[PDB]
Amino acid sequence: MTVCQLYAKQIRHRGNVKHNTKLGRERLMRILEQDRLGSCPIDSLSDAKEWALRMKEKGLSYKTINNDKRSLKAAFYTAIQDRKNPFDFQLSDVLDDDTEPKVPLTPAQEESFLSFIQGDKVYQKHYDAIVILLGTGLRISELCGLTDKDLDFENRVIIVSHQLLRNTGVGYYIDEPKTQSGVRKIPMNEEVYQAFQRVIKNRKGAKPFIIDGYANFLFLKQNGYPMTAVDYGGMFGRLVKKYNKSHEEALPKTTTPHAMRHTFCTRLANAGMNPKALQYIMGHSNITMTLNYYAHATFDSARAEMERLA
Amino acid sequence: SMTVCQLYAKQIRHRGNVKHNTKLGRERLMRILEQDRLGSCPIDSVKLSDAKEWALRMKEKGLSYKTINNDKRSLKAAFYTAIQDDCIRKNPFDFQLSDVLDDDTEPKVPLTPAQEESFLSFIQGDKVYQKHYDAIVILLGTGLRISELCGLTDKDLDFENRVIIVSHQLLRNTGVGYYIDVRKIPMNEEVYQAFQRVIKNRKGAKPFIIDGYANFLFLKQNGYPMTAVDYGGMFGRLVKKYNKSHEEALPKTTTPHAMRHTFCTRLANAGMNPKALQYIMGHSNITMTLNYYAHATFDSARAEMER
DNA sequence: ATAACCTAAAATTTTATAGCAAAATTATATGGGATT
DNA sequence: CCCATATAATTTTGATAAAATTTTAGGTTA
């Protein structure tokens, strides 16, 4: 009979969720509890737009305000199933998308970025980690999850069958795909292969660690335990800021561990790699995400291709 | 309460702004409902059992799989509206047709390059159908919808830049007669050399000006423009004559749209670069075009990932 | 004598989707330890 | 400045039918 109580019921309905979801839901539950639109009766469309106006004034980005709306709309979708859905509208009207464009790295930047890492006495230890990302386009947690079992040196193949993440409290835990759709095999090039060989040959001080039958992880922290998402993201934040201070052409504002995946995917799509073959290596279930890396065509473009394949 | 017939009828007025083909498509279902025992059942007393059982009768009656799956959507939206007005609690048509029925739909097989340049050679020689040769080369070289080909006029073409302007389609339905219902296509030399021939060999044009459109490129025997039915019916005769002159017959499902299927496929398997096929085909979503692309395995990626 | 065309009629197919949030990645404040 | 980590914010990612086209039955004509 209130909004805050409503979202609590929607949370108890679909309980089978990962750990990060529970955190993300609590953040929204904290927002509803800290706003006037959280103490009102569900039976009491204009206020939802006003709520969207306040979240924009809080400082939260467009998508952050957008994703939350979808959760509330589902909560009222079930409520109406059990008036009119007050969150049934387009956020594009109330607020504008001030989202930052994730500009990839130009081949000149990468050749200068890697050289900096290699020649930097502080971050040269992560060089082998970065090269593989620009050769496999692995997700950052997929990289941290790799063990000696998931590598095929003889056949040059990376078996991506899991991901290793760590959260506050729960600690380390292994996440796996339900069906065999998640599993994919990524081929190693000479740069990637010889990078893994250096990681294996230079691994030392691995403290005793086993989680759900996984051990001998490749990338470990200085504290003895494997690297996590935060450990690599925070390293990038320091590395890029150090690169920008010594290089005029500062790296893109989105130069994050995921941008290494951006750059990888964008390259192949530009070089004319098979769109479905790219979808596999990327691990996209829906082809739509992969096709976003491909440039929008024109008449001249469509004509050129027709004349190229005539 | 009210029956299903009265609910589907009420859902028809609520959503009126529909084109003629829709009305025809909606009327067929309304005939089915009146014919079926389901149409007389009160909306409230319709259970998931009754909804699934209806799908069985449709197949037993002879209807194809995709036919029953579309009518399922037309009826689901009706109960959905009936559920929105709080007439009833749950929607009986919320289930997968794959569980109750099998998808025995004929696979739409496009023409292989070997079949293509053997099918064209037959048209160019057969006295009865060489008049349509120029038209087919266009359908295969442009990948147009069949009514959109009928719509093409002298004004739509641009021989200077060799581009086709597709902005409309010409339709004909019983009673209404003819009626007109947004992309640009590059014309290859083979398609252009056909287009220049169609105009130079066009005559006996009747007076025809519909919705601001006149001088259609492809005309029937009676001087009036070709329709969708006239081309499909022509293909039913053409294919049957090919199969007698050749041992290895053509695909059973070879139709005007198969000439489009063949174009997109041959383009996709040629590796046509991004979304330019999507632009040349004219799909709203990119997902529709990717269906014309072959499924890739690990081996397909291995060779493609070579650099 | 058989197809070849035509048309009303009944059928099949083509085409259309953001988004009725989860679940990841990234940024930051804090604080201790190694460097310039 | 590096590193680790708790906290928090941002990003990345899972057909509630219209409107066409195809086929077919019946008839005439080449």
Author numbering:
A (entry chain B): 82 to 125, 128 to 165, 169 to 396
B (entry chain A): 81 to 261, 269 to 394
Lines from the paper:
The Tn1549 conjugative transposon propagates resistance to the antibiotic vancomycin used for severe drug-resistant infections. The DNA cleavage and joining reactions required for CTn transposition are carried out by a transposase enzyme called integrase (Int). Int contains 3 functional domains: an arm-binding domain (AB), a core DNA binding domain (CB), and a catalytic domain (CAT).
We obtained crystals of Int82N bound to a 44 bp double-stranded DNA (dsDNA) oligonucleotide mimicking the CI. (A) Close-up of the active site in the wild-type Int82N-CI5 complex structure shows the same architecture as in the R225K mutant. As before, Y379 points toward the DNA at the phosphate of T-1/T-1’ (at 5.2-5.8 Å distance). R225 forms a hydrogen bond with the scissile phosphate (T-1/T-1’).
